[PDB]
Design an enzyme around this catalytic site. Sequence first.
Site, PDB file in Angstrom:
ATOM      1  N   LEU A   1      63.863 -55.782  15.021  1.00 31.57           N
ATOM      2  CA  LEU A   1      64.690 -56.086  13.756  1.00 31.57           C
ATOM      3  C   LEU A   1      65.585 -55.002  13.322  1.00 31.57           C
ATOM      4  CD1 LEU A   1      61.925 -58.106  11.967  1.00 31.57           C
ATOM      5  CD2 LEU A   1      63.967 -58.942  12.926  1.00 31.57           C
TER       6      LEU A   1
ATOM      7  N   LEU B   1      59.542 -55.800  17.051  1.00 33.86           N
ATOM      8  CA  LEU B   1      59.719 -57.185  17.343  1.00 33.86           C
ATOM      9  C   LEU B   1      60.162 -57.099  19.165  1.00 33.86           C
ATOM     10  CD1 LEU B   1      59.676 -60.418  17.055  1.00 33.86           C
ATOM     11  CD2 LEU B   1      62.075 -60.393  16.359  1.00 33.86           C
TER      12      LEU B   1
ATOM     13  N   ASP C   1      54.360 -59.398  13.868  1.00 32.77           N
ATOM     14  CA  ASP C   1      55.392 -60.337  14.165  1.00 32.77           C
ATOM     15  C   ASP C   1      55.146 -60.618  15.854  1.00 32.77           C
ATOM     16  OD1 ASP C   1      56.727 -58.353  15.455  1.00 32.77           O
ATOM     17  OD2 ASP C   1      58.190 -58.328  13.907  1.00 32.77           O
TER      18      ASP C   1
END
Lengths: 260, 257, 259, 258, 256, 255
Positions: B64, B113, B144
């Site tokens: 991210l 991520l 995540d």
Amino acid sequence: ITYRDIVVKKEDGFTQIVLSTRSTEKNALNTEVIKEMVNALNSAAADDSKLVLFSAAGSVFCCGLDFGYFVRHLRNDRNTASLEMVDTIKNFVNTFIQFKKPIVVSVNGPAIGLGASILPLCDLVWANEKAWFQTPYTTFGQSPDGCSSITFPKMMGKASANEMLIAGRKLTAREACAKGLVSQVFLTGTFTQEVMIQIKELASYNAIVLEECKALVRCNIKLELEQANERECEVLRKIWSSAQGIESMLKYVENKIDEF
Amino acid sequence: TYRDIVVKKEDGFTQIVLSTRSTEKNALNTEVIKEMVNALNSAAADDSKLVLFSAAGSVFCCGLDFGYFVRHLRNDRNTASLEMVDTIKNFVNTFIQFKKPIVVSVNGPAIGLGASILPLCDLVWANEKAWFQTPYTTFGQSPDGCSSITFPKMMGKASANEMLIAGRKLTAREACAKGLVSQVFLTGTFTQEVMIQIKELASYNAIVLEECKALVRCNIKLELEQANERECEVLRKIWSSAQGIESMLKYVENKID
Amino acid sequence: TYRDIVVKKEDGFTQIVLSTRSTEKNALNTEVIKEMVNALNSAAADDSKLVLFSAAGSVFCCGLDFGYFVRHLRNDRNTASLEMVDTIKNFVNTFIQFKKPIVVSVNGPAIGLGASILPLCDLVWANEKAWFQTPYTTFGQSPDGCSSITFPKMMGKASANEMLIAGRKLTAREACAKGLVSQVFLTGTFTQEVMIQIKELASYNAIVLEECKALVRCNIKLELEQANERECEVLRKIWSSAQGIESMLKYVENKIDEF
Amino acid sequence: YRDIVVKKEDGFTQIVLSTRSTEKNALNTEVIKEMVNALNSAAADDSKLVLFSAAGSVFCCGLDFGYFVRHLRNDRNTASLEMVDTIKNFVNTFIQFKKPIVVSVNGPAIGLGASILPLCDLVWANEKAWFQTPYTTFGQSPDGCSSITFPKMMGKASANEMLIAGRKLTAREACAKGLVSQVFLTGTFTQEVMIQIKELASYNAIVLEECKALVRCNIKLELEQANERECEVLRKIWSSAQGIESMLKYVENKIDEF
Amino acid sequence: ITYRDIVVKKEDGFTQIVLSTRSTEKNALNTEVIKEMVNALNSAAADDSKLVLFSAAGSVFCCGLDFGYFVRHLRNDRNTASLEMVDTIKNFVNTFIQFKKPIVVSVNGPAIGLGASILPLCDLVWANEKAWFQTPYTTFGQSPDGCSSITFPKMMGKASANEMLIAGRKLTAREACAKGLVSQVFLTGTFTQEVMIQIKELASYNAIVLEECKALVRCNIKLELEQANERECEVLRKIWSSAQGIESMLKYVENK
Amino acid sequence: ITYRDIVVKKEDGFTQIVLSTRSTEKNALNTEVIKEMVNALNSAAADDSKLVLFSAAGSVFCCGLDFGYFVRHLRNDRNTASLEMVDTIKNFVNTFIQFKKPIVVSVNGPAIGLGASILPLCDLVWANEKAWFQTPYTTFGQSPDGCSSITFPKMMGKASANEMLIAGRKLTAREACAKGLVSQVFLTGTFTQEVMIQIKELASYNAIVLEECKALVRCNIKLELEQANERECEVLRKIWSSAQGIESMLKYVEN
């Protein structure tokens, strides 16, 4: 019973079952060998042993299904022969899934395809350092068998398991051991005496402690193994009765034989 | 046309290459995610047998883009954390629902991520110089990409927490041993080798390949879905809070990389 | 004050140090277990972000104090094995139910229940000289601590059974390769590295830490609860039986500690 | 299709069981694979739901044992394998079906013809229809997942009155026991069914499918597992001498009450 | 603690929570009403009660979600509003799932939508013979709420459950009793005095026994309920954040 | 094969076990009667019957646990006696759970507490119309036993289950049949005649088929029953070894 393709040796505290084929080469699995195996297992389940040693005679441990044999039968009649084929494999796999006593498997050499995927269904896997392990399903033209579709991802992770399942990668005894497939590696020189001395050690333990250790471990995995087996077999019945799956098997056998 | 990715339709396979222009170092903003999902939706409906997911540049994917995201969270906390979480969920689920095998080729560092999505793919091919980290506690976030179940599943809870809590980095070799990577490739021949191997995979029976993936994905899929939703609900809570924004701002203003 | 543990409330973490007086080499009797549970319940309620579980002496925890429980079983089999099995069950459940991360520090051998509770913790930091065994077949017992599910989950069934059935010892490094240990330390700098890394973890966001634990533990919690219950049910059966009593009487009598 | 009639309409697809290769809508191999084919088409089409109904005086008398016992009696092993394979896959088609299925029962539903009803979503029955799963009379264990679906809707004791004791339920008593969800008067059964199906077809397609999905959700795996276990057992009964013997006895002795 | 939409009575051995809304019609539920209920439910969990009596004042027990209220908020920003709406519903439903004391719900008017689907989350359902029950989700344009996607099939079988969930049929108190939704039906004339007599009877029992009967029953189904609530709310969020789903709610509120 | 409190009949195709106590009132259950039932069931399991018929003599079926018997024991030694009591209930309940042959139960009169709660562990339940059913746990001062904490909600829903479990509700044979507790109701004049006709009908069916229907139906619920039995017994151990629990039983017995 005395068997064509296996030898059974009943000792105190343990029963030996030795894959030693005559109707196939390097301990290949055809219908008959499989029914002898299930038969020897059922009997070993009922005798006075605390555990079972599953070992093999000669060069390779088990090269898996004898496709040279099965491809003739599916070529002769694909819809009947794949029903029988898949039913005997499922029955074979379930015999391991349902087994109450601990099974130590002793691997002297190459374990391939179904000869490899049944290994995680036993309780201890003891490998000679010179053995290697492969489930070349994509080369065969089939999807997984032996519940390897769940047991491989569970012991090595999904990516690593797919290197075996999709990419058809071989693993030395020491690599298989690092990936969880093999639980102990032995020096080749003293393999059978070392296996023999460790098996007798295990046979000296409390039978109930042994059955309970295995029962407790088996609780929350058994239904998963049953379902994977059922699911894999359903898929194999549709592949092996298909035009491409037969062709794939044919192609594989013609290539396997075509070498010096 | 794609701004941040390249799509190559090849014989038996589709290559999606991460190659960002709106971000540095292949970082993920909502825009980049959108492109990849569409590329993946297109590849699923085309006549390829599998997808090769790779990237261009010094890094595979640094996760991210928090520099981009913290600005949006400070604008409107509730809207922006929700859109952000919704797009991640969808991104993750696309991997979970995908029927064709996905091979991921990692040519550089994969962080956050960028690393947690790799377990949702079928094979993970890594350059020996690639490394892996999910420094969630440095970021100021919970897991995540389903990594809260996938990491414990491949390496056991303790080793998985070394990555999830302690923010430990793994070399491609260490990751391979821990199950995050399935094959390590030598640096000199990396791209040619990856291409030779993908082409051989694409020579395999398509039905065998799909059935195989279908049989593996089979007893994990619901858990993955449940984990994705649970993960995303916690992130929305964290990213809509003052405390969560403060952490993200700490990380953006203090990070050295 | 506890007679078998030291508790150090610290800045952002609480240290629980096993240092038994009523037992040898940090063995577990009813008293020691009760104090551990006490301390863990207190630590669940303090504002520490995490717990460091360490030990004092040459061994980390040799597990059940069998010399203690054996006369207790020999007296009143039925009620005594219920007590004994219920106190283990509760000890194990306390780990299963614990909301905050537990980092465990291992500076010597962890044997039996001392090793099987480790997978219920969050990070396992072991001195390179530490070793790990669950010699259940030697005790005359089926697994405890949820190891019937946790071991095969981290290392695979066959590798797990080398521990559970074959009674094999694992070095710190081998335990690390098999999932049981998450970080190995050199002996010379062990306790100082452990302290500096705990304080780094204690500097992280409290909510973030609690949420990492919750999500990881989430899809395994009921499995652990059920495996604990099932294992204790079997242990009550074995320890209340003629042969299981004898096995324990035989062990504590024949045993010559290799730790 | 020889044995079924498909009637796509606005918002719904009707599939009518109307056999000509068997009597009284019995299921043989041909009939089953037509039904699976038609259900697969219905899954792929733009309909919101499926109406599964029947022509004639009987809804479905289940397995055509006269047809199957001929095959079993030639080759126990191969015929029981094929037979179980076709039932499993039939049953699985219902289990996996994603759109609501309304089943319209015009007459007796017997054996597998009653055991499939709980795999549908609404069961609408003529007051004159009745329901029976006479497994112990056939000489088999349950099929269609009725080993779990009957105990689940009516409790185990009442389920075994059907599965063990072989008792018949009128439409009304099947309704009180949850097997039927609506009873209709006999004179204009089809007219009244058709208006309610059109009402259901006026609903949002996504809402209808989400309702199906959220219910099937809780129970899908248990259904697949029950199907699997039952078929395993039937493979053993139907390839045994006792099993073949029971099926011949049934076929030869006493004929139909429908 | 005072409330605008509910009356709480701390009686001897039991707490009475009365739904009696002022900011909605027919005891409809909006955000603030749900919040006041969750608050009074938490308070009763904490007090010395052995059990809770849940009832309502007026001609209607509860008509469920206030779609007039919610559609206004969804119009503004469907994305953000569907989350808020779905999160307050989830929390409301979870409050009943986790509730450790017996809850006795007393129904003296129509229970509709969310107003009916919470009933299986309570422990005993006592209804006036004149009460009726409906979950007309397909009329609203939504999938199930309140765990009713599992609670209705589990009590009546799937086919009967779907007559409510898909076909939106109304069940009289008698029919709902035969279907397991209602556990006792009362003649109308002395309904509330009868209910009050019986709640004092229940409150005479040992508090631990009462809490233990509840815990042992709930134990087998608690995860399933929580997961049902989870799935249901995930799906409701994707319906209420869509064009089609807002249209459905708009049409429903306008036609009214 | 001799029993003080039960008559066993090894009949043609089926074995009938008749509860006919002397050591207790109204076919009540104490340690010895429970231990006799377990032995008689274990023997039935081993013989060549295809099914078991569980009946009772006289006008009541089983009024459940004899609290007059048990409370003296609890007062004497609460920890030992509450554990012994809970262990014998668990093994009794587990005997039904693990049973491979179908059990038909013939209910001639009232079934109360554990006398009603074992009924769902059996396969068919045939009741005389004047038979009635109650599990008045809240009157005794205990939590549920017999797996009824799961079996009652699974047959009738949670609300109707708590009418019985919490609210002391008594069901007539007709209401119990409507709730799925009873599978068949027989008019008074002809109960025993009809039961005997019907059990001979079932014993004429294939043995393996009967055992397979039982194994398939039980399959789905087996682990849940076992977990519920374990769980219930744990809680009962706690209540029966507490002052308030002993107080509750004492009151119940004095009243």
